[PDB]
């Protein structure tokens, strides 16, 4: 079950590592270009925290929900800010969010009382009048119900497919940093002048195996010069000596 | 231009970095690492300007 545009849930993902590579083998998506930044730097850019927002969109008008564009479901629904720190991902989810008669569990709000500030969880609905007609629990002339359920039909096809879209909001170096993407690991080469980097241990030198062992609370090793000379290996549990030149 | 000036183009990515004062006049379709992709645009392939 996937969140809609009216009941959009701010999913909070924290205290892990966020690799966006397992989604590529699913299907050719409707779109791939992230809107705030380029899609070629999704991994190296480390952010403090991530906010996920899930949306089922009727039709194919996810273009109008953009940082710079508005619409019927972008001014009276979830509204993307024009200074949005994050990006989008949309993909054709016809296998889950469709029905043969209609996806009547969902809803859309075509219009509201007034234009809403972005990042506002607008979920309250009410009967709407026509200009100045008094409307209190009545329906018919000048009192029409402004909501209608989603209708999925096989005769609709292209132009009414869901294209499930998740937006991701980031923060640029102001909070504690818990979640981002990892890097690659290059295998150790012994007795070779390598420019080593053990999670930030910048320096150049050759690598040997050290007979001494560290305690489980120990990770580094110093000397008289107060610099790194023998450290525990990052992704494997043995102690490696940095022999200098 | 009042509805937007699209006569000036800029580049978003390359294969790698570039040395100073160099000109990258060559324009071609750019793929992402390992996916076989040439000729037209699509998944992980779009025009870099």
């Amino acid at each position, epitope marked *: 079950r996937f969140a809609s545009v009216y009941a959009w849930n701010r999913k909070r993902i924290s205290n892990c590592v966020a690799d966006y590579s397992v989604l590529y083998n699913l299907a050719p998506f409707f779109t791939f270009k992230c809107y705030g930044v380029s899609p070629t730097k999704l991994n190296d850019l480390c952010f403090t925290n991530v906010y996920a927002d899930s949306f089922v969109i009727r039709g194919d008008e996810v273009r109008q929900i953009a940082p710079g564009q508005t619409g019927n479901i972008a001014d009276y629904n979830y509204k993307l800010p024009d200074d949005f720190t994050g990006c989008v991902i949309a993909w054709n989810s016809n296998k889950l969010d469709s029905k043969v008669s209609g996806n009547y569990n969902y809803l859309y709000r075509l219009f509201r009382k007034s*234009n809403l500030k972005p990042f506002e969880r607008d979920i309250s609905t009410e009967i709407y009048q026509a200009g100045n007609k008094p409307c209190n629990g009545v329906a018919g002339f000048n009192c029409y119900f402004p909501l209608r359920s989603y209708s999925f039909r096989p005769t609709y096809g292209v132009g009414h497919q869901p294209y499930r879209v998740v937006v991701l909001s980031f923060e640029l170096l102001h909070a504690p940093a818990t979640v981002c993407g990892p890097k690659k690991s290059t295998n150790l080469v012994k007795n070779k002048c390598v420019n080593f980097n053990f999670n930030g241990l910048k320096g150049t030198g050759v690598l040997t195996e050290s007979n001494k062992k560290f305690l489980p609370f120990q990770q580094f090793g110093r000397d008289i010069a107060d610099t790194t000379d023998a450290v525990r290996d990052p992704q494997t549990l043995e102690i490696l000596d940095i022999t200098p030149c | *231009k*009042v509805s937007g000036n699209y006569n000036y183009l800029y580049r978003l990515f390359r294969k790698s970095n570039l040395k100073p004062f160099e000109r990258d006049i060559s324009t071609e379709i750019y793929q992402a690492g390992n996916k076989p992709c040439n000729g037209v645009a699509g998944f992980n392939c779009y025009f870099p300007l």
Partner: antibody
């Protein structure tokens, strides 16, 4: 500087308007200047129609793309606006003007008025 | 959008001031707003470009200033032919890129 505006007096309801305006004397070695067309009917305020730069780019008002065409001479003589499928609410006067971006309409022509024959 | 009073009147000679305003969301940072004057049967002419910059050929009695979201112009030393159709034109990014006033018709009591 002179601006000359020419157009028909009365037009058929199914006819197409062919307005012409000529400009004499400008610094054409520039960027962002151009020739604009605006109209207004009596009883309602001004509203902008179109503007052309010196690079051939045409900017019309939105949702009026199909029924607005521009002939640009590339000889610094005259600019023609041809608009098809006219509406009797468009019976109005038309001004051809110079268009920079600070001066929204710097110098204004005399313009011509048109009405429908229906 | 952009709006101004439909008409204004006052004593001849002095004591007149005409203003325009608009919604800040539609208004793209409020730069390059200009003030024109239209005559019946005559071509309109430019009077003020970008709030408070004076072009050549105009008199020093025309002045303009903008505070907050509202711009305005003042003129001192009115005459018998100073009735006008003062318009404000501006840039609006969300709707049609240019906006042209709301209509003015100054009248005198001479």
């Amino acid at each position: 500087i002179t601006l000359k505006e020419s157009g028909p007096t009365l037009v058929k309801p199914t006819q197409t308007l062919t307005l012409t305006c000529a400009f004499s004397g400008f610094s054409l070695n520039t960027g962002g200047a151009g020739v604009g067309w605006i109209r207004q009917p009596p009883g309602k305020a001004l509203e902008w129609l179109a503007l052309i730069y010196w690079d051939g780019d045409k900017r019309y008002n939105p949702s009026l793309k199909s029924r607005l065409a521009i002939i640009m001479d590339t000889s610094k003589n005259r600019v023609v606006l041809t608009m098809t499928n006219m509406d009797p609410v468009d019976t109005a006067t038309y001004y051809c003007a110079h268009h920079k971006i600070e001066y929204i309409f710097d110098y204004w022509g005399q313009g011509t008025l048109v009405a429908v024959s229906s | 959008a952009l709006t101004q009073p439909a008409s204004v009147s006052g004593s001849p000679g002095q004591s007149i001031t005409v203003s325009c305003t608009g919604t800040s969301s539609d208004l793209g940072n409020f730069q390059y707003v200009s003030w024109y004057q239209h005559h019946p049967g005559k071509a309109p002419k430019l009077l003020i470009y970008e709030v408070s910059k004076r072009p050549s050929g105009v008199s020093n009695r025309f002045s303009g200033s903008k505070s907050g979201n509202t711009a305005s112009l003042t003129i001192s030393g009115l005459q018998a032919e100073d009735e006008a159709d003062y318009y404000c034109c501006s840039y609006t990014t969300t709707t049609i890129p240019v906006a042209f006033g709301g209509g003015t018709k100054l009248t005198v009591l001479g």
